[PDB]
Amino acid sequence: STPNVLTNVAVSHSGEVDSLLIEKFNGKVREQYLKGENLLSHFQVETVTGT
Amino acid sequence: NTVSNKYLGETEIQVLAPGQSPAATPTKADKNQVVIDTTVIARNTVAMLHDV
């Protein structure tokens, strides 16, 4: 009626590891969304080197 | 003298474990009918002499 003995391949015979699957990676990495305001452009900014 | 119609219902969904046959779910049905039993008329008579 029912098989009841499945030839499952994802189960390790020894039992050391939970699963034999490899956990594929989709190729996406995320950082924050912060963006530069660029606010110093308005002001006059001189460079001081000697003093 | 009558006209009928039928309506069908839902079907249920359920989880399955691998390697088994899940139980079925029934679907109900019903009917609706209309009858026709009465007629209406309007009649008028005109005499020949009164018509001419």
Rg on CA atoms of chain A, Å:
30 Å
Question: Quick one: which chains have the greatest interface?
Answer: A-B, 4 and 4 residues
Helix content of chain A: under 10%
SS element count, helices of chain A: 0
Largest sheet: number of strands, sense, barrel closure of chain A? none
Task: Say what oligomer this is.
Answer: part of a larger assembly
Strand content of chain A: under 5%
Distance between the termini of chain A: 93 Å
DSSP, total strands of chain A? 0
- Described by the principal axes of the CA atoms, the overall outline of chain A is rod-shaped
Structural class of chain A: little secondary structure
PDB class: virus
Keywords: Podophage, icosahedral head, virus
Entry title: CryoEM structure of Klebsiella phage Kp7 icosahedral head
Chains A, B: phage major capsid protein
